[PDB]
Paper text:
The side chain of Glu102 is also disordered (subunit A) or flips out from subsite −1 (subunit B). Subunit A of the ligand-free structure adopts a conformation in which both the Leu100 side chain and helix α6 are close to the substrate pocket (type 1), while subunit B adopts a conformation in which both are away from the substrate pocket (type 3). The overall conformational change on binding of ligands is small (rmsd, approximately 0.2 Å).
The [name] protein, which is encoded in the gene cluster for endo-β-1,2-glucanase homologs in the genome of [name], is a glycoside hydrolase family (GH) 35 protein. We propose that [name] be redefined β-1,2-glucooligosaccharide:d-glucoside β-d-glucosyltransferase as a systematic name and β-1,[name] as an accepted name.
Author numbering:
A (entry chain B): 6 to 691, 699 to 716
B (entry chain A): 6 to 691, 698 to 716
Write the structure that this text describes.
Amino acid sequence: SEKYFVKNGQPHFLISGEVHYFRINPKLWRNHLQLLKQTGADTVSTYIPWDWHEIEEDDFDFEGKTHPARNLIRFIKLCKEENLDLIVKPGPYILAEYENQGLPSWLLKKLSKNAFALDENGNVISPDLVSYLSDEFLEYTFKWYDKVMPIISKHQKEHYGPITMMQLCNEIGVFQWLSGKSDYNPKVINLYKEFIIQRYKTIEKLNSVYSTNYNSFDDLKAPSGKIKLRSDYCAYFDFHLFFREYYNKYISILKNKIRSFGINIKLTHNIPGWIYGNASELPMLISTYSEIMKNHPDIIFGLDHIPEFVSFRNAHSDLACNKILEAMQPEAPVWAAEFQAGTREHHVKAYAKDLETFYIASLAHGIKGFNYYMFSQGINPEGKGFYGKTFYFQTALDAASNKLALYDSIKKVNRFIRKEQKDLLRTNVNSEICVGFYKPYFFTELISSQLLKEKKLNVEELGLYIDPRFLREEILFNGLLRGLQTLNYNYDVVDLENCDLKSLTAYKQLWITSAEFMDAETQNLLSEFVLNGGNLILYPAVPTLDNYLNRCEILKNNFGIEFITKDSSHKVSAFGIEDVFTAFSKKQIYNDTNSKPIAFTQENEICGIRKKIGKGELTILGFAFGYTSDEHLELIDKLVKLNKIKRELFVSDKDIQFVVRENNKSRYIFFLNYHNERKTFNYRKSSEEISIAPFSYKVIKENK
Amino acid sequence: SEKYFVKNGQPHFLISGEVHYFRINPKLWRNHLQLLKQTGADTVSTYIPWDWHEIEEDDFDFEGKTHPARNLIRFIKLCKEENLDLIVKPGPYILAEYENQGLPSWLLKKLSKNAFALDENGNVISPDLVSYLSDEFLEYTFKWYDKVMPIISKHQKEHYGPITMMQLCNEIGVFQWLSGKSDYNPKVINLYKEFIIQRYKTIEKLNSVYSTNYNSFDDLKAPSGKIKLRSDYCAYFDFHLFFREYYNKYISILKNKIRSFGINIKLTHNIPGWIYGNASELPMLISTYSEIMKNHPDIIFGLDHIPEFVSFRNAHSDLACNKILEAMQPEAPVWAAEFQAGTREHHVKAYAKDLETFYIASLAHGIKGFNYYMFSQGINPEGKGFYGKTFYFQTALDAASNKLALYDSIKKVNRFIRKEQKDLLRTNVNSEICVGFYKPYFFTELISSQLLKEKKLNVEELGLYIDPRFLREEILFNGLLRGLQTLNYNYDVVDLENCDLKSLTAYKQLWITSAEFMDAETQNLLSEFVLNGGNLILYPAVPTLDNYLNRCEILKNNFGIEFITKDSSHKVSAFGIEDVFTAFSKKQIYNDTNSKPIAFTQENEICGIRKKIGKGELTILGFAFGYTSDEHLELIDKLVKLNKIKRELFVSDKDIQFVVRENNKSRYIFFLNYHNERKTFNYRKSKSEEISIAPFSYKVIKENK
């Protein structure tokens, strides 16, 4: 049932620590590794920076010939001697606050202009930003691979070396997220043209979907600038699809090259997106990897969790991310490839007592393995740091291997995980609620994000009122998912793309946060789900358009729904809850023939109905709410209770969060106090009186 | 030397609690007032909502004829019976999470289009957002004042009523700021044209400053859209100067109207700007009040502090805000008109143990009075809540008057205040460091802010590289001021506008965070400061332009500086500190003439010097740093120590914050732990005392003599 790492044919909790040999005095390599093993960690993880080892063109030092900290071979030997497995990350990009993001200075100086990512005017975006599919870039990457990959191949577990996994590059696409800028390198744009011809076949077909007036594919230009027309939206939508395919073409080239060295170990990639201690943008970054995840069952994506603190302000972020990755990557364990230990930023403190609670919360929230990033602080050699001499602060170990406050917290958590892993890894939560993940709402990193200064997507110019990023961040991520977690209702997430109806029948309710657009396949899926006996909760809009903003009213028609969109006060009443604040003046007002009205505008127009369709049940709310009042928690609670869903426990203090994880034999109850208040409470199934410190936890075991 | 409130010729710490009579069962008003008085509070504060009392047009209820909680008159009488003084706040705007921000529904339905704030297209920005000088808006406002002001006048302290203070309107500009758009209403555009004609006299003089080619003032239009030319920047700069006059005209009209009722009590206004628990934009909002604070010595501005939590992430916001209000309003005590109690937002928790530390930190940080907002929870009657039925959570009292967890925290703090106020209010911190506040850098709410929808200002298009909002947010507010507080160096802030040289000579160092532009008056002031014996630290730029981006090289010439601007690595070395990360590739490279070079680029070019000039000292760094690395604290520490400034205490844990306040009689040592760590440390005045402090907690030590 559960997915988990395995060691010696038994469940294994992967405990890795990140230790950058190239940033640590080599006299202290053994001490760092011993102190890491002594916490109960089983694995160590590092970058192998191209710039650090190809010191000049075709001059490689992996043995400390030119700098003792270039002795990669010795570091691998010490990992083996100190009984740690090793994760290696040879790039070619490593980021990691390393100058030029790990690319050699000599390479960036030598590359032709056409090897760089270019803006729409043919100017170099950044002196350290190559075009991923540049011939010259891949030729040099391949020569780096020809030197580092034989070493990695020799030192795999197979050959009783320590190497058990390898990351390909680092956060593919990250520079487009950070800048909001696409690569317009003509070679990229040629691949985009081929993608469009492949997709539409004829200019007439393209013109019919986009409402363009092209005489041929020769008329077609890559989109740029603000979206003013529905045709611009269409072109940008497909440009996002193209980048997902392009990142798959890149990682496939690296993967096939790596496999040519007989490297048969597990391959990895990593997903960023936390900002200022919350992760509502991370699902957008998950969505950039949609094509890789479809085409590579053998590449495990892990999460980069950067909470910064642990409170009710961010309690919901890690769980939502873990659940969305599980939806998109069901056949691999959910693990944190970069699991905050200390802080990248001196002024952004990472307290041991916060991170200890985050580590236990992560267990509650289904994490199956993690890599403490950074377990060991580093000192940048020889000028090579982008930001200062020091790499991370408040780590488990400083760069000199001094133990810091976090060390004892990691040892304590690791001791618990080792004691419990055989049973804990085989537990799941009993979710009766399923929440739909509609990937096209997330396809906006070039047009609408938390990092994009000037928004290119303004849906009011397109004749729309529900912005997909507002919906996915405030109505879904910070709204419904935060509210369910706060109310201690389990949910699962499901990827609606190519979704199997049979998997939806497990759940008592499916929740769909819908904008005005949804593709035919998803409208058909939801239609069949209800007609066959499913209970659907759908808000804030019945969709009437497809992904290209062309008419598509399958779900509306199948469900017998009629509506007019009308302006009214932001507040509605719903299920007898007065003064429910909603996001929009515009609301769907429903015809109530064969329906039960359950929500009303200030002038008593019907903005929500319940209906029986076939064997199933529909609840439609023509208004948007997230979680910004107690009325929103009341409404989510009432909606869940329509299908008689119960929490696992009665807990006397509603502001205690709990997670019950179970299998046939074992139950774990995780109690999490995300508040600056000592809380005393009691619990029972739906003597037993417990006190939890501020920003703390308690784990109870029950035998069944 | 300290400014503080006075009652009967003695220092008085103003302790107010906000209690909304209109959101509380009137049978429980007395119980709320008694429980507030029992915390040691002396004052209660409330809005008087126009929508609540003018129930239809020209139908007024202040006596509970139509709803018991419209009985304002009984609430005033109960304040008197329960020995609480009263602050009243009749609007016209109140915000207060009240439908339509407090304006009557009947009003917003009746007003014509011209009464609203409009975008550059002519469209209504928000259906509750009026244009302040709208003739129609002011006519209805005056009719509301005609009914509420006689009541306020009758119940003033001078007539043995409880009313001691009144707020005019609420956070002027806040509704516009939150909308993310500026007001292009036609009353506004016409007043702007009069403003420009009065400022420049002839189109030729305007053209000489802006480098424009207008044939007449009739050709000049209110600036709109993005700044592409230095002349666009000039137009928007005057547009900012115009809005500061516009807000002064609004408050002036309200004040003159109020005074006509024989209302002689203290008038107030309240300052917005906290966002998600920090206040880096608050200085922008306070700068919009520049002309009010110059023209109205009798209107006391107070701060609206909304920390939400109390940690290292926002520790510097309240002190920086308190210091900037003191700079703009040096003749009145620094007070919080709204001092967070509970939370306005159910999903944004406010923990008693956080706010108790915030209260003590506020005392350390020089606060002289406050109004706990909200002391009492409310329930909206009759659907009046903007966002739900309940008004505030985790307050001192719930709407029923039950004590909640915060009540005992507020009683504890108030007890310490009442025991100590006679001495505590008279205490000062010994500030050897003065930081300059250059208001023009803040004048960007039309073009560049955290809330503005459209970024109109891109300095690179103007041939500049130092953005005034980046400088004031990251180099000054989150950088220098955060760094000085973290290092436990006391600083004062001084407004450079019409600044007296004698008010700068008391300090060992003056720190100026400078862009490439600075007016001739300020360039001249700083020149005289150093020539006369001042010690000046100036970065990241010697300015070479004035506020209209025209040539002004006064300070460069007076300091005998030559420089070229050159691109290099972000990293520099400064005072032997290697790998100091700086914000820009571009840096100032100084000639070494008659100077000591103290900072170097990766190509070892000189990007900082120190020199002696007349009787004074100059330290110039041609690179920008805030506080985003440990090297930045090292660099600030090195700079402070150039003039042998010392901390007041040796403390064994550098992450403990302290403030020493003293007068002739008493010394108070405030220790603040903004970190989630139980800390045990020792200290001594610069045999050591040992202290253990809880996470997110505080200690106060009083010493006699």
